[PDB]
Design a protein around this ligand. Structure first.
Ligand SMILES: OC[C@H]1O[C@@H](S)[C@H](O)[C@@H](O)[C@H]1O
Ligand SMILES: OC[C@H]1O[C@@H](S)[C@H](O)[C@@H](O)[C@H]1O
Ligand SMILES: [Cl-]
Ligand SMILES: [Cl-]
Ligand SMILES: [Cl-]
Ligand SMILES: [Cl-]
Ligand SMILES: [Cl-]
Ligand SMILES: [Cl-]
Ligand SMILES: [Cl-]
Ligand SMILES: [Cl-]
Ligand SMILES: [Cl-]
Ligand SMILES: [Cl-]
Lengths: 128, 128
């Protein structure tokens, strides 16, 4: 279980109410505990105390010595327009050399388009 | 009327079916014609012929000598996760030093969150 996506040595804890507390030998075991609970979104593991705290809600970051905070999984890589349920674009177009406004124009002119993104040279259209 | 957002000298036309054809003296007048029609999304104006073609649907770019293609307005600047109707985020958080996966985690753990974006240091949560 990949635990490289988050800092282990920066004292980052989360105050969110927990679902479960256990003691485990490493961060990867805490992650595994989190994955075993359907509703666990993230976890705080403490290096010194070895307590592992599984949590459901959104993180509430704060500083506590020895803490590290990891997601349910590090597999989640998306940062640009990230639909939780996935959602296939209505349209994906090469808009090299075009302003954002013309991707806006494409969305206005496409029935069902609620949202557009323009990263790099790609104009991409979505329906809710 | 700002027409700087698009190339004037690169022979970029659009094949989309038109709403209206007129002759005008400049690109800014073609833009003005487009704005006068509720359904105009973009326009192609030709430098040599001076024909201005107002269009409703999504652009269909192609090469034609003297063409330029402009949006309804250049005011539309958004490129990152652009909701046509606007849509205020459910949540906006400082996630400095966090992987995308923890913004994913925030969305999972927030009732109503359908979509997240993580640009710079900001984790931002949306409902449809
Ligand atoms: O590690 C110390 C510990 O403090 C408790 S009370 C928090 O809720 C945990 O997530 C963790 O940060
Ligand atoms: O400018 C020549 C002209 O060609 C017609 S037939 C297209 O639909 C116009 O948008 C424009 O590209
Ligand atoms: Cl580290
Ligand atoms: Cl703090
Ligand atoms: Cl992913
Ligand atoms: Cl294309
Ligand atoms: Cl529509
Ligand atoms: Cl130019
Ligand atoms: Cl072409
Ligand atoms: Cl804007
Ligand atoms: Cl904050
Ligand atoms: Cl939900």
């Amino acid at each position: 279980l990949d635990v490289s996506c988050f800092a282990h040595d920066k004292n980052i804890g989360s105050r969110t109410e927990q679902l479960s507390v256990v003691h485990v030998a490493s961060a990867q075991d805490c992650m595994k505990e989190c994955q075993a609970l359907p509703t666990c979104s993230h976890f705080t593991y403490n290096k010194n105390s070895k307590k592992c705290h599984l949590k459901a809600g959104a993180p509430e970051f704060y500083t506590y010595t020895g803490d590290m905070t990891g997601p349910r999984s590090c597999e989640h890589n998306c940062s640009d327009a990230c639909w939780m349920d996935g959602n296939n674009p209505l349209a994906v177009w090469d808009y090299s050399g075009q302003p954002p406004a013309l991707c806006w124009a494409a969305c206005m002119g496409t029935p069902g388009c609620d949202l557009y993104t323009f990263q790099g040279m790609t104009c991409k259209l979505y329906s809710q």
